[PDB]
């Protein structure tokens, strides 16, 4: 089985108003090039978690803070800059406070901009107006 904590306390990070939901493809070593994962977007609190579909676990596979994070698109066609092999088109990265830069993919070209603008919302940047 798989489970971190028994499960008593009340949700927190995942206790935010869903702002965006769907399936994305996060880039990570091992396994196929890119793996599809169910990403969830929340607000107040502002967080973004994702769960592995291939598996069967309520809890997310990960999740990083949005407040102190960033998001951008990868203009560089085909490949971004120095990513293993190549990558799809119309992707986006997320620059966290640790200047990690998490590369993710959207279901559709639009889905991206959406998943992007969305994140931004949570984070501090352009949105208003």
Curated annotation (Swiss-Prot):
Organism of derivation: Homo sapiens (Human)
Boundaries of the shown chain within the full protein: 238 to 353 of 353
Localization annotation: Cell projection, Lamellipodium membrane; Cytoplasm, Cytoskeleton
Protein name: Pleckstrin-2
Domain named PH: residues: 17-123
Function per UniProt: May help orchestrate cytoskeletal arrangement. Contribute to lamellipodia formation.
